[PDB]
Amino acid sequence: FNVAHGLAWSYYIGYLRLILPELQARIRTYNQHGAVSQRLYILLPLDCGVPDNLSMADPNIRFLDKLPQRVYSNSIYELLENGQRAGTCVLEYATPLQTLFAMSQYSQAGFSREDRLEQAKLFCRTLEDILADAPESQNNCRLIAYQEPFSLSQEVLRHLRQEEKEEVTV
Template sequence: MSQEEDRFHAHSFIPRRRGNWAQHSSYILIALCALILYLTEQSIRHVAQCFIIHFVALQVGALFKGICTFTEEVHHVSARYRGKYFKALNACLDLRRHGLLLLLCGAAYLLLPKETGLPLCLKLSLVCLCQLLAIVFGLQNPSAAEISELCERNNLNVAHGLAWSYYIGYLKIILPRLKDSISVFSENNKSLLKCKKTWKLHILIPLNCEVYDNLWKADSHIQFINNLPEVSVDRAGIKRRTYKNSVHGILDENQKMHCCVVEYATPLQSLYAMSQDDSAAFSRQDRLEQAKLFCRTLEEILGKSKECSGCYQLIVYDDSGENDKHFLSKEILRHLKQQDREEYAMCEKEEGCIRTQNCRPVEETELLISDYDQPLSLHSDSN
């Protein structure tokens, strides 16, 4: 992981991807159990026999669980598995893996000398009974953390789909054309957006997902100035479908205007609407988690897109419980001022680029996350 990614993931707002600590911990516990068995000085044959019996019982329990699941899936074979029963059965349990393990354990048990005690069939029946009771009472259900990890590893989250849809259906279309649109706009509005380093789309990502259709309703210090020229493309059967972005002016404490192209990330509206609809079964906590994952996924997607490089800036913030009615404008200005402070030297080198409140160049696009402190550095460590 690069230092830039470390700075991004280090922020408390956005969770980093899960690692392999659970697997490493299992290795440590296996070694600890082996050490305990060694110190107890039990007969190796007896320990091996008990181990095989319990291992076989676990596999049989998994088979029983798969069979119970199959009794439900068999009613959906036509709709979910195209009428293929074997495919439905394979979705419920791994026949090859479980079958092979059972054969190996059975062969190993037959090679071990038999000891007095309960018959093998009775031992397996008792252990399997315990496994089935655990299934019935839900003791083997995955935890919330396991479900979350499974969804993240397999990209099954709502946020993942929304981020890709937002990128493919919108950002990938407008960002490569954004600078051309701003160039045309600047020819008729030469007092605005003078420095080319500011020619990017500033995307607002509120973690509470409250998105306003008009930015001035969120903050009266944000004023609409004009729209950029429309981008027209043929899209999904729609001839000359149009896309456009808006230039807004941000007033500071001295009533000076700072101009930039800024808008909300529209998929957040879907997350907010889902949390307000009971039929979606989507809680506020789910919304917050998915908003964070949306932010992380979008940053990862855009970070790998050469077409969109240098054309965007993500501004993530959390204004829940914030009483300042001008919080959003101050948040945007704080980032813009940070850019002006760090990139002013580069801006001066550009021909005809004069330092004004409207000139805030940025060399590298980086995710900016506010936590009531100064914004993160915009300098790239790779330069």
């Protein structure tokens, strides 16, 4: 009874597959007006704790604007270092992770905190395999899996600079 399989497939079939194909084009139009990354960075906190505002999780992550255009709203966030803009990217949480959290607060589910973490890892692996064989192929999508004990802004910044490195070497 692996609930992550359904959550991952539904997350790709019902959401990721419908916003990723034209994601770059929306970013390119924005970048015509600083610069924004080309990929959608999805945060996968293995504790399955998704706050309503990303600014709370890390003070160095601050809202900048929403990416201009079923229709779904993605928003561009800027990451800070000593109060200075070190990176800006489209950041969003893995929404199915809250479904794992709500199940663990549902006594009739039998979902323990250990089961939630275990399913969170399965959700991350399955989405990886899905996107790997996917037309978007993570070419517009990066997966951020992190287990809080940690600067979240530093972890996304590390991947952003690596993406820029790849963009100029390859």
